[PDB]
Amino acid sequence: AISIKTPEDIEKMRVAGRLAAEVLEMIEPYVKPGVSTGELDRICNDYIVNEQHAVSACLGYHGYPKSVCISINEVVCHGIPDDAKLLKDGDIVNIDVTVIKDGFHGDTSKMFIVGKPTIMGERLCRITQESLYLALRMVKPGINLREIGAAIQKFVEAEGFSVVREYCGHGIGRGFHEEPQVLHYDSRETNVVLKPGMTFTIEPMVNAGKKEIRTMKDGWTVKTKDRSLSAQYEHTIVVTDNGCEILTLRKDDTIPAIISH
Ligand SMILES: NNC(=O)c1ccc(-c2ccccc2Cl)o1
Ligand SMILES: [Mn+2]
Ligand code: NA
Secondary structure (H helix, E strand, C coil): CCCCCCCCHHHHHHHHHHHHHHHHHHHEEEEEEECCCCCCCCCHHHHHHHCCCCCCCCCCHHHHHCCEEECCCCCEECCCCCCCCCCCCCCEEEEEEEEEECEEEEEEEEEEECCCCCCCHHHHHHHHHHHHHHHHHCCCCEEEEEHHHHHHHHHHHCCEEEECCCCEEEECCCCEEEEEEECCCCCCCCCCEEECCCEEEECCEEEEECEEECCCCCCEEEEEECCEEEEEEEEEECCCCCEECCCCCCCCCCCCCCCEE
């Protein structure tokens, strides 16, 4: 049973969402060749705790060891920050942030292109973000999640890319992952009609190559089976009366915070 949020709770979601977004805005300057994913994590955690007076929702979740997930190139998600893993020219990197503030969660992520961008890493990130934007434009009461998943997949595959099946968007509030599940592809199992007040995430994972993925033996790191590049972008939203409001919008986003139909 999916739950609706109250006006007060939604305001708290705006705050946690903004904080999540601001972590990504803060870290951007440090995302350069030579930096380790470990340092970036410590920077993010220090900021979340000492500046935002919030806490990382990832730290300890199901035993997660770090504060943010950092995934590079062929790594699909849940990449673990490490003091020896350095970023280099050409790399595409996702920093996945989740913060809890005043009891509510804010969840978002984006891609960063390191050094000189390559046409393909550049193209994969742009298409991935557009697939998120396209889905965000469909959000309004009355529409079924299945349609949104359908549209993301059709857009993505038309570009020669593939949509990761194992992971999905999700309801969010006082809990990290609440109902419903938000698939980024068409599924006969999906039947959820949006309603005002619902809060969830949209976070498509797109592979340049095949959809198949393999988990590493650290029990967390997920890579593409064919070792092709993978990209992801995420935003937390609240369904409004005639559309939705992006709670994790950043200065660099090129979509309106409030989407009115
Ligand atoms: N958008 N990112 C997420 O929803 C997310 C980040 C980390 C996790 C996670 C999922 C299952 C178990 C442990 C973690 Cl930290 O989910
Ligand atoms: Mn999420
Ligand atoms: Na990746």
